[PDB]
């Protein structure tokens, strides 16, 4: 601190209260602008509808096709590109399927190669994409 006077409690408290807004992560969680424009609206998972399967071009030196899926959520109708992870798991997903879309890892940030893909697919219509990949369960049709 700077001002140390014994009767300077309201200034030292109120100055922090103002300068705490200049903290990035405070203002993301105290203005509702991030909470508004969070595509899930503060959920860890969200169910949506696969309307198109889109193969995203990997960014810098890593030259590869990142097989993602454009999903439209139930609660919002706000449209989301969700990266389908494992080796040959886009072939479990088809048009107008229900998919449980989780966050990617970095709390609404693009992770690794994939540009602007802030979400990933976990379940493929009540059957998990791990159980389909390991072949412990099958996809209903």
């Amino acid at each position: 601190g700077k001002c140390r006077g014994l009767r300077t409690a309201r200034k030292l408290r109120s100055h922090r209260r103002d300068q705490k807004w200049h903290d990035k992560q405070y203002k993301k969680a105290h203005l509702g602008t991030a909470l508004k424009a969070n595509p899930f609206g503060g959920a860890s998972h969200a169910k949506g509808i696969v309307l198109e399967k889109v193969g995203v071009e990997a960014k810098q030196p890593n030259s590869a096709i990142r097989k993602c899926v454009r999903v439209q959520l139930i609660k919002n109708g706000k449209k989301i590109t969700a990266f389908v992870p494992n080796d040959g798991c886009l072939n479990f997903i088809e048009e107008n399927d229900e998919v449980l879309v989780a966050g990617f890892g970095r709390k609404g940030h693009a992770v690794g190669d994939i540009p602007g893909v802030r979400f990933k697919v976990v379940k493929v219509a009540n059957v998990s994409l791990l159980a389909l990949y390991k072949g412990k369960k099958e996809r209903p049709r």
Binding site: I65, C89, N91
Partner: protein, 56 residues
Amino acid sequence: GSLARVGKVRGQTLKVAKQEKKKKRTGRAKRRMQYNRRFVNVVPTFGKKKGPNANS
């Protein structure tokens, strides 16, 4: 462009069937197997150490 070569490798790598192995002892029994490997058998090794999974 092309979402056409999805699962190219995993698809056409020749599947080796998982091998019949002796069932590993579980619970305190593993730690007995794990302890008596580490600090009751072995000797001071001149030069730098080998890893437990050091195949050479």
